Amino acid sequence: VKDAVLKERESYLQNYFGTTVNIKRQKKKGKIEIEFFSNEDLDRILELLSERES
Amino acid sequence: VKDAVLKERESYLQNYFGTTVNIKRQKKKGKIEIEFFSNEDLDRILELLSERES
Structure with a gap:
């Protein structure tokens, strides 16, 4: 597993809530x-x- | 605002993913x-x- 896959998600999560996100x-x-x-x-x-929309 | 409202959500989030969750x-x-x-x-x-289910 490469963290790049999750780290590109960090980028999306930050924009999603409009806030700072960090995965350790x-x-x-x-x-x-x-x-x-x-x-x-x-x-x-x-x-x-x-996820109450589901 | 009282953190109790968010802290009761901590309880639900932990069960949701089956993991430990902490709000600061x-x-x-x-x-x-x-x-x-x-x-x-x-x-x-x-x-x-x-929330890609939406």
Whole structure:
């Protein structure tokens, strides 16, 4: 597995919420951190993570 | 705004991907970190963040 595949997704995620996104590739034991500057973005970001549209 | 509203979502997000999730409430300037133990979960988590089902 090459992180480039996930890192190109970082680019899309940043534009998606209009915010900063960082994936930590650490022996597969990492985390994706979606930053937010308001509690409004927070509620929205959690909404995508929930995918309630489905 | 009370973090309890977002923190109850932390509980749901953890069950959603079957992984550990942490929101950092820091003056609205925080981040949601979705942890993953495989690159498979990583690809899946990014998929929800993209909400391509919509």
